[PDB]
């Protein structure tokens, strides 16, 4: 009834306290999202400008955003009107509102992936295991129509049919697009997405340890220095006789 399989712990290149994200793997992750997931999954808090200097060149980013139609307005007659995207636009929502999103996924609501790796226990370890973990239901388990069996998803019946399969796309950087190769990449992306600071946050953490180390020491001496007066202190009771 309340049984569940927990995902394992893969050794991500960005797992270390001092390990930055592999920006090469993130550029790919993006491609995966852009050409596969963005079909049902929104990413409301990221924007084309965010890719600049992280995974793409300014040229690239701008063209990447001009590949989309963006509603704007009103004009002079208070009329909405399409237009090409600017680097300041947010990634395109594939549905106008949840109601319609469910309406085209069997009533299932594909969550916005912006903060996903932090909204699910397991983070990328989970997301990964789930993407690559689809399989056949065991003896005695009947999966409702329209649903799929995944042991990693709580309830084992997930509404998302396996999104990735070998060569489903082609990394223009020449990396063998096997299935786990993809999943591995897109997960690395969903991390960068849920927290762009990541890299800088750790570079700081480094500086913090060094100064913290050096400083705690200096002050420990100074504290002992002053206190010595009281530490060495000697007293005697010489009542008069």
């Amino acid at each position: 009834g309340e049984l569940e399989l927990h995902p394992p712990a893969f050794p991500w290149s960005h797992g270390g306290p001092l390990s930055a994200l592999d920006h090469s793997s993130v550029r790919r992750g993006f491609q995966v999202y852009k050409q596969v997931c963005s079909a049902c999954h929104s990413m409301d808090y990221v924007a084309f400008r965010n890719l600049i200097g992280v995974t793409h060149t300014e040229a690239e980013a701008k063209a990447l955003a001009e590949e989309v139609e963006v509603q704007d307005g009103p004009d002079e007659n208070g009329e909405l009107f399409m237009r090409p995207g600017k680097i300041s636009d947010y990634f395109p929502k594939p549905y106008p509102n949840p109601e319609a999103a469910r309406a085209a996924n069997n009533g299932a609501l594909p969550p916005d992936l912006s903060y996903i790796v932090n909204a699910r226990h397991g983070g990328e370890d989970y997301v990964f295991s789930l993407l690559t973990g689809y399989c056949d239901p065991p003896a005695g388990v009947v999966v409702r129509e329209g649903l799929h069996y995944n042991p990693y998803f709580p309830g084992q019946a997930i509404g998302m049919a396996p999104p990735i399969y070998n060569e489903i796309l082609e990394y223009d950087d020449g990396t063998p697009a096997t299935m786990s190769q993809i999943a591995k990449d897109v997960c690395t992306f969903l991390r960068w997405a849920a927290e762009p600071e990541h890299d800088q946050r750790k570079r700081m953490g480094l500086k913090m340890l060094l100064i913290s180390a050096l400083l705690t020491s200096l002050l420990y001496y100074m504290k002992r220095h002053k206190w010595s007066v009281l530490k060495s202190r000697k007293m005697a009771y010489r009542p008069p006789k």
């Binding site: 001496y221 002992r224 220095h225 002053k226 010595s228 007066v229 009281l230 060495s232 202190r233 000697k234 007293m235 005697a236 009771y237 010489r238 009542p239 008069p240």
Partner: peptide, 16 residues
Amino acid sequence: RHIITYSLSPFEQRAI
């Protein structure tokens, strides 16, 4: 009453 205490400057002694 009747208590003597002797102490040394910090610059004359060892910290730790």
